[PDB]
């Protein structure tokens, strides 16, 4: 489908860029590319339609353009409320519509996460199963990235991470569950949860001991 960067990272004040690169059977054919904004647990919001057009309510710091097969959304007036996921969408002929891969904007600067990592309980190991619990809380805005480590390697083997949920203080929380056999627990020296929120990364680590 349409391909856009996995992550964009700006800092309050202004200027930024998100690219939706497509084929010639689109973008470099139609003036039919829309840009949508999605906050955690909410419906996407039309920020840009038909390449360069703004709906009603959408601030003039959002804009778009195109060059051949490259579509470009730019936010010039960056702001912590702008931290969200951004989707490219376009009409690729034959009466079908395609979406982007998803670009995750992050605003370097100001609510840091409250990571708390729990190791597999003494009992669960006796149930022939093992689970690592990375608990994240009290971070704003609601966009965070979670990466797991086995000693010093990216695991990714069944990580199950939750979409951030609004709390009673208008802040967010998330949870990451690493599932593995106890055999791959007594083996490796350590396991780490890396929580990246806005450039700043908080890392917790535990070990079999």
């Amino acid at each position: 489908a349409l391909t856009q960067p996995a992550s964009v990272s700006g800092s309050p004040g202004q200027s930024i860029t998100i690219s939706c690169t497509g084929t010639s059977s689109d973008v470099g054919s139609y003036n039919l590319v829309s840009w949508y904004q999605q906050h955690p647990g909410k419906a996407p919001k039309l920020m840009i339609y038909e390449v360069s057009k703004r709906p009603s309510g959408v601030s003039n710091r959002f804009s778009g353009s195109k060059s051949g097969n490259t579509a470009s959304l730019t936010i010039s007036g960056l702001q912590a409320e702008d931290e969200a996921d951004y989707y490219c969408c376009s009409y690729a002929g034959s009466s079908i519509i395609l979406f982007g891969g998803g670009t995750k904007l992050t605003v370097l600067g100001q609510g840091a996460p409250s990571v708390t990592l729990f190791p597999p309980s003494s009992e669960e190991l006796q149930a022939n199963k093992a689970t690592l619990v990375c608990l994240i809380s009290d971070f704003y805005p609601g966009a965070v990235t979670v990466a797991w480590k086995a000693d010093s390697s990216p695991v990714k083997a069944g990580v199950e991470t939750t979409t951030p949920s609004k709390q009673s203080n208008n802040k967010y929380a998330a949870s990451s569950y690493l599932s593995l056999t106890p055999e791959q627990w007594k083996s490796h020296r350590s396991y780490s949860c890396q929580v990246t929120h806005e450039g700043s990364t908080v890392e917790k680590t535990v070990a079999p001991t």
Binding site: L46, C89, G102, T116, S122, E123, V133, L135, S137
Partner: protein, 219 residues
């Protein structure tokens, strides 16, 4: 105030079929397309195809043709989406979004101009069977909690000391594993001067399986 209001979340066995509604109010229902878009828990958006609220003319992506049937009742101004032969990966949030207007000057469906959306209806297809959770202790100012693991369906309730405290208590949203089973954790923050001098207990309830379980946390 144009707005779309959909139905509220259904859990279906794999191999079944689900039908989602979308009530449009604020405009002439028969003058704008309605496209249905879905997204997986953690993944991105996916176009499922459009409908013409007047002629009921439909078109879908070539990977939905056969399973998806999009209809509409114009009397009550609502659109319907039916997904058949539900598979595991068909667990997603299903949105209804208005499109471009209908006119004679130009345009087939085409236009990805979804100005107004709906609150999304989440369908959950899983190896559906009711099961009580397994509760594990999470031992260590310090924090301690309970791992409520492998249950179905939503929801479960977690308390502490039968409600004697609510301070530092923070019950997390559940996660849906690839085995169609849920799991969450409930953590609480307490002084490191209270260890061995105060009993901390998590009380969990999963009514659908009805499983009340008290579990204690010690270092």
């Amino acid at each position: 105030q144009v707005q779309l209001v959909q139905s509220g979340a259904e859990v279906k066995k794999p191999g079944a079929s689900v039908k989602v509604s979308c009530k449009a109010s604020g405009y002439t229902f028969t003058g704008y397309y309605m496209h249905w878009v879905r997204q997986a828990p953690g993944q991105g958006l996916e176009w499922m195809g459009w409908i013409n609220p007047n002629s009921g003319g439909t078109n879908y992506a070539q990977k939905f043709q056969g399973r998806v049937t999009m209809t509409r009742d114009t009397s009550i101004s609502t659109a319907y989406m039916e997904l058949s032969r539900l598979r595991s990966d068909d667990t997603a949030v299903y949105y209804c979004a208005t499109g471009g207007w209908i006119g004679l000057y130009y345009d087939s469906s085409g236009y990805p101009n979804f100005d107004y959306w709906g609150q999304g209806t989440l369908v959950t297809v899983s190896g559906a069977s009711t099961k009580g959770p397994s509760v594990f202790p999470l031992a260590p100012t310090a924090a301690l909690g309970c791992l409520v693991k492998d249950y179905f369906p939503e929801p479960v309730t977690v308390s502490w000391n039968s409600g004697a405290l609510t301070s530092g208590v923070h019950t997390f949203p559940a996660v849906l594993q690839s085995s169609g089973l849920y799991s969450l954790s409930s953590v609480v923050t307490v002084p490191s001067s209270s260890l061995g001098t105060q009993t901390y207990i998590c009380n969990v309830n999963h009514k659908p399986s009805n499983t009340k379980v008290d579990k204690r946390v010690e270092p």
